[PDB]
Symmetry: C3
Subunit: 112 residues, 3 copies
């Protein structure tokens, strides 16, 4: 297992940490949502939660990433939920497919 801290940013001002697919995978529209492995695991830094979002270059090439919420205390593997929009999409091993954004986790009095 590899932690969040192993992820990298494209540039200092890049909002997201890049997430790569660990397998070669082919996706077609009729397959619907698929969960792609990353080999990267939660949990997140205290007081933060994560959002998985698409990279625009990948979205424009026809692979939609469904935004996903990563809970602060999640300790499982971060998977990318993805669907081919219109056409056959081929993802190669180590391709940068999504990005992880970290956001503040607001406290509320909501019952847990």
């Amino acid at each position: 297992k590899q932690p969040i801290s192993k992820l990298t940013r494209a540039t200092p001002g890049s909002a997201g940490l890049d997430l790569c697919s660990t397998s070669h995978t082919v996706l077609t529209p009729e397959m619907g949502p698929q969960a792609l492995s990353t080999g990267i695991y939660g949990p997140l830094p205290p007081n933060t939660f994560g959002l998985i979002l698409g990279r625009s270059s990948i979205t424009m090439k026809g692979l939609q990433v469904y935004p996903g919420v990563i809970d602060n205390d999640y300790t499982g593997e971060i998977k990318i939920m993805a669907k081919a929009v219109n056409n056959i999409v081929t993802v190669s091993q180590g391709n940068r497919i999504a990005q992880l954004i970290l956001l503040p986790l607001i406290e509320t009095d909501n019952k847990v």
Copy 2:
């Protein structure tokens, strides 16, 4: 009407407040986006805004929730904007279909 404060978190580290559908609804791909009732109303806590996002277990079962922005001062009913991706999806009353994330509302000098 029920306020945000009545919503619940799965767990202390869960980023989202769960949103349930108040009706039994069937969705097919050809129907396009549908607004599902929740019986839950704005407004939000001061200096925050909301984002409606899908639950991953639901996304992977073929129901896409379109991310929605809930404005701080919205006082209407929070509805879930949803679409069946590929197949017929059946939502039962009280099923947890989406989640509400609260985020800080940044001030800017943009004209209003």
Copy 3:
């Protein structure tokens, strides 16, 4: 080029800055994702990043906006990544098609 500061909010409590299309464009489902011009450019205020999200009235009319991350130091044109869901969608010049949300950019020790 026009900066972010020229954008406007619907109302004081509106989380988003409105983004309008600079061209008349027709979209059909088979076309897949399209990048719509806005004539608005980065960069963003220090310590913030942007998220492009759909307006709910537009989503419910059948035009999906793919959430997009705007990096702090992006200096290019902000484009709206959009797809007609089920039907033919016609976007007119100056129509409000998306919104820009500003969020805090969290610092991490991730290698850049």
